[PDB]
Amino acid sequence: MTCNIKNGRCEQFCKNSADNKVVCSCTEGYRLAENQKSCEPAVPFPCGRVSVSQ
Amino acid sequence: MTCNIKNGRCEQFCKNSADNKVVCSCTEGYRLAENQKSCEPAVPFPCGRVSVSQ
Amino acid sequence: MTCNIKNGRCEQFCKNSADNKVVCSCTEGYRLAENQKSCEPAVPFPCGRVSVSQ
Amino acid sequence: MTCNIKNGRCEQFCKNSADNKVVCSCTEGYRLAENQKSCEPAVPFPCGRVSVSQ
Amino acid sequence: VVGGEDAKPGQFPWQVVLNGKVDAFCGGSIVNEKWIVTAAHCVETGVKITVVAGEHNIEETEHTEQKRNVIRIIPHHNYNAAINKYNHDIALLELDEPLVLNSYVTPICIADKEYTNIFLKFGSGYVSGWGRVFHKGRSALVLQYLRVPLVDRATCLRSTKFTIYNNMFCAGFHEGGRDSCQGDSGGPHVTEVEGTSFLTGIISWGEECAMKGKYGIYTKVSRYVNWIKEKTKLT
Amino acid sequence: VVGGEDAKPGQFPWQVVLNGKVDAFCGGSIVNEKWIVTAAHCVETGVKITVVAGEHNIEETEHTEQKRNVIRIIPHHNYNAAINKYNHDIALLELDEPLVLNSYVTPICIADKEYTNIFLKFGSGYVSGWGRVFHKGRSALVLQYLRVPLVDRATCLRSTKFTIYNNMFCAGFHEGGRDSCQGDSGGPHVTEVEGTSFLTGIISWGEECAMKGKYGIYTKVSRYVNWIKEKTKLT
Amino acid sequence: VVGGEDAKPGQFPWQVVLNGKVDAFCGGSIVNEKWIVTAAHCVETGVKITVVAGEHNIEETEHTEQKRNVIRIIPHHNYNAAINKYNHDIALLELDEPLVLNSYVTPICIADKEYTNIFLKFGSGYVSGWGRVFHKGRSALVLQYLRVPLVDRATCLRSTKFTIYNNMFCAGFHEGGRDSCQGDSGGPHVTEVEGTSFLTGIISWGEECAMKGKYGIYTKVSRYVNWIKEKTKLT
Amino acid sequence: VVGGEDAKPGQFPWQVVLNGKVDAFCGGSIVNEKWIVTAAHCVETGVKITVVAGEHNIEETEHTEQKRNVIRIIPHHNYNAAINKYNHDIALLELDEPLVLNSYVTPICIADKEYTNIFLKFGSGYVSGWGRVFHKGRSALVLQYLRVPLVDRATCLRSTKFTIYNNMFCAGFHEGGRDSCQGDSGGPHVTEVEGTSFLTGIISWGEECAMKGKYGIYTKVSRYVNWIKEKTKLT
Numbered sequence A, B, C, D: 001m002t003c004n005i006k007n008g009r010c011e012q013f014c015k016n017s018a019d020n021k022v023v024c025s026c027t028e029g030y031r032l033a034e035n036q037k038s039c040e041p042a043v044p045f046p047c048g049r050v051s052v053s054q
Numbered sequence E, F, G, H: 001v002v003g004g005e006d007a008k009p010g011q012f013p014w015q016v017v018l019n020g021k022v023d024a025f026c027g028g029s030i031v032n033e034k035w036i037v038t039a040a041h042c043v044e045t046g047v048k049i050t051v052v053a054g055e056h057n058i059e060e061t062e063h064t065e066q067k068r069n070v071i072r073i074i075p076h077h078n079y080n081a082a083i084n085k086y087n088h089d090i091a092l093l094e095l096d097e098p099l100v101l102n103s104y105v106t107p108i109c110i111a112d113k114e115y116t117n118i119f120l121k122f123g124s125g126y127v128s129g130w131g132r133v134f135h136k137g138r139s140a141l142v143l144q145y146l147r148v149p150l151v152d153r154a155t156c157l158r159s160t161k162f163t164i165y166n167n168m169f170c171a172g173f174h175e176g177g178r179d180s181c182q183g184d185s186g187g188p189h190v191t192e193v194e195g196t197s198f199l200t201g202i203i204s205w206g207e208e209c210a211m212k213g214k215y216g217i218y219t220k221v222s223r224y225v226n227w228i229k230e231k232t233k234l235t
């Protein structure tokens, strides 16, 4: 609904659009998932991700 | 270009749109002029206007 | 030296005096200890103190 | 009474003392007047002063 | 208003005068045909209030005037004279009969909170009223106006021992001689935006009028614009 | 309290429980022998309130407990449930008979506004109460406590659509699982200063307890310490 | 200065003019007998600079003038023309021979950081110089001065696409017609305190002079007063 | 790191160690295959620096390590060791040969200024390094990490006589025992956002490590993210 509240439900970045709409986006190496809110890897070793089993 | 700079050139109100666009608007009794930036009277006695010769 | 740095070394309250001096003070039920910085109980059940063995 | 209100009535600089007292002071080339609030020239050409007839 | 100038007829067509047990005890601004915005401390009384719009000389007839009775007063819900006479100093007056809008009876514009504050921060507003022309002086006959600069908040707090709340702002001059005064309270502090005036404050209080080292204290309207629109809605 | 730990007897000797139509509906803190500080929303009722100090297990007897009746309730003058249930969420309860001070019934210290805020800004406070141990859950039998970090104000405002007023602060964890909850309201948020606890907040409200991305909302006591001292004065 | 007024002789006895490849390319203020404070961007050159104190009409002789050579220039250590032409826009000029203090050659007072900012926040300063009297215009012959109001920081940032750093402040008028201009840079922005002027800014830059919706940009001297005193110390 | 815990292999795959005249004198973070971000004070030396990525135990081989030479160092343009050792404490190291990205050698994400600050204001970051495990102690063999809470700025300024600049933030604990320490400088302070870590700080300095009443001081990366992206761009 708005970037001002819960980041407009975007996992990473949010931008306000006209008429109480928002566009979600992600950092380099990530793409906007199906839900248009979540971020998923778009490269083999996306930044800031732990891929080694913990 | 942006509401953050010179009110996006809107005479009264500005709202940011997607991709560095803006929408200008006016207070009650006014309408957005041809230029889509300026405000002009839309009623006989618009608020805050001096109409008596000075 | 100053109330602006480490509370003028006062355990509780600090007030700046003339020429880079400070006066330390304590809340109700406490008195300024010998060192003129620390606060010690001045009553049987001083506020905010845990006296039951933990 | 306090530097926080009307500069403790000091013409130029104010410093808070213990027990709601203040000490007034002045910039270089000035001295604290009789009233212990006002600043008066202590040198032939004190800074920031217009001495040529206007 | 101390040290201002005479308005020209219709120069402040949103200005109204409030008359009671005494004439021109406060001012107000036209929100719409049925509602005036004023200071709550003006209308903390049991005496009946009359509103006069299209007014220029409170002792002459210009043929542009409109008198109304007040049927209801809505002080802001936070205002509490017992705690503080001037904090949340804003109220609305409902008129018995609608004003007839014309070149001399025109509402003041009211932006949202964000833009009312942007307008206030432009730093130069006009205050108008029929209040005293000197501290302890006579009222003005002709409506007076004065341009007043906004004052830094910390500077204002340093100027007085009285609490300046975040619901207030200060405006005026250090040097003394120019200020709003008794009888102006309730009237408008407006900011002109490309020829369109917006309400940015309510004239509220001060210590001695136009005193050196003292400022005019105003209700910060930005905090109340939503409430004004919500309570004065007609349709 | 969700995700806290059992207090040890006398670990929070300022804590009291409020009992009414339902037991442990809110907490409170001992100001002095005759006065409790709590949340105003706790005591927006016509039902009689009982205060219990020296309490540890609300269903057991430790031989350290003291029950009192409330003879007067002073909600803060700005509190207004009609406008907002939680803004200025603070009230004082006068007890019928004085509490007897001991190792289990000890007042909380209350600094002035400046130091209460310095203490709050140390950033780590303890909350305690007999409130729900899970969102929609049962009350605690043994008093619970939880250390909660202060939350940045803009971060808190971004976390909810509800207005966070300047009379409130947020504290708690992003990750969910640890928070105050229903029944804890009214109780203390304290900050320990060299072994001496000071009151820095009143447990007030939140959305679902201990939810991820949500925080506990507390009354910012610094804004009310003068009023507490002025209204609870004995001599 | 656009839209100002002619100074009277000795009205700004701290003002100096800087002469180089071109006369009156910048101004400056007397700190003491050996030092001038100016803008760093004025003295980012290899050409020799001459300082003239006791100056009134740059093309007449009043018999109150004193010319000196600059032997050393100290730009503030943070100034970096490669990154930004105007951030940390302050420099000191050491004179070859001391100025002789008199009614026409008098230092400007410089308070500490706290009081320089209090003085700035009074909100009304005087700027003076021999800069252009219109945007792209001729220089002034007689020293000009102009009173300028301080501008709210967010309002200033909204007025331009250029970054306004925290080392700068804005002052001037929205309506256009009054402002400092090319050739005034380096000169003083002063605030009078009970008849004693204190340095509150350095005239720095702007876009087109005295343009509507634009302001004068000034170095915020409060951030540099300690450095001025430390670098200009004589004994 | 004092009072932290051993990382698991690949738990901080952006972490690098800097080796010189002495091993593990500072840390750094992988920006991309050719660039490391570290603290400027780490690389204010004429000695050659070696970078090691995929490192876990600085004295063992995990078969996940990658050593590179530094061919160029870009300290931030505002950093000036002559004025202050730690203000604008950030630098970039260009590697001779690209790192090969894998589960053990992964860049740290870097948001824009607005989001880096939002992430910092969530208030809980992880610091990691091979620095001293006690004040004046030995280095760690296994990479250490520690979660540190953000500290209120005024609280941090009150904790020390040393200037805390707006290019720095404080994080850590009042109680002593947990903090970054010598040898950790240059390494990352990160904030996890839904499982994706973002760089929110650079480990910079402090007084005695993990001392009661003292905090870790960090470079506020939000002020430098644009510069990082602009200087490290590959295509």
Ligand SMILES: NC(=[NH2+])c1ccc(N)cc1
Residues within 6 Å of the ligand: E179, E180, E181, E182, E183, E184, E185, E203, E204, E205, E206, E207, E208, E209, E210, E215, E216, E217
């Ligand atoms: N601005 C003033 N000094 C003032 C304004 C209104 C008023 N009622 C009293 C004083």
Ligand SMILES: NC(=[NH2+])c1ccc(N)cc1
Residues within 6 Å of the ligand: F179, F180, F181, F182, F183, F184, F185, F203, F204, F205, F206, F207, F208, F209, F210, F215, F216, F217
């Ligand atoms: N912190 C909370 N989620 C909370 C606290 C009190 C309460 N009454 C409801 C919720």
Ligand SMILES: NC(=[NH2+])c1ccc(N)cc1
Residues within 6 Å of the ligand: G179, G180, G181, G182, G183, G184, G185, G203, G204, G205, G206, G207, G208, G209, G210, G215, G216, G217
């Ligand atoms: N205030 C201005 N517009 C200005 C000031 C100095 C200058 N060099 C250029 C423009």
Ligand SMILES: NC(=[NH2+])c1ccc(N)cc1
Residues within 6 Å of the ligand: H179, H180, H181, H182, H183, H184, H185, H203, H204, H205, H206, H207, H208, H209, H210, H215, H216, H217
């Ligand atoms: N956090 C600290 N006490 C610290 C960090 C780095 C360092 N080089 C020295 C001290």
Ligand SMILES: [Ca+2]
Residues within 6 Å of the ligand: E055, E056, E057, E058, E059, E060, E061, E062, E065
């Ligand atoms: Ca009349």
Ligand SMILES: [Ca+2]
Residues within 6 Å of the ligand: F055, F056, F057, F058, F059, F060, F061, F062, F065
């Ligand atoms: Ca019990």
Ligand SMILES: [Ca+2]
Residues within 6 Å of the ligand: G055, G056, G057, G058, G059, G060, G061, G062, G065
């Ligand atoms: Ca001449």
Ligand SMILES: [Ca+2]
Residues within 6 Å of the ligand: H055, H056, H057, H058, H059, H060, H061, H062, H065
């Ligand atoms: Ca190794």
Ligand SMILES: [Cl-]
Residues within 6 Å of the ligand: E137, E138, E139
């Ligand atoms: Cl009269």
Ligand SMILES: [Cl-]
Residues within 6 Å of the ligand: none
């Ligand atoms: Cl004026």
Ligand SMILES: [Cl-]
Residues within 6 Å of the ligand: E122, E192, E193, E194, G174
């Ligand atoms: Cl405007």
Ligand SMILES: [Cl-]
Residues within 6 Å of the ligand: F137, F138, F139
């Ligand atoms: Cl239950």
Ligand SMILES: [Cl-]
Residues within 6 Å of the ligand: none
């Ligand atoms: Cl935790």
Ligand SMILES: [Cl-]
Residues within 6 Å of the ligand: F122, F192, F193, F194, H174
């Ligand atoms: Cl503490």
Ligand SMILES: [Cl-]
Residues within 6 Å of the ligand: G137, G138, G139
């Ligand atoms: Cl010319």
Ligand SMILES: [Cl-]
Residues within 6 Å of the ligand: none
């Ligand atoms: Cl003007």
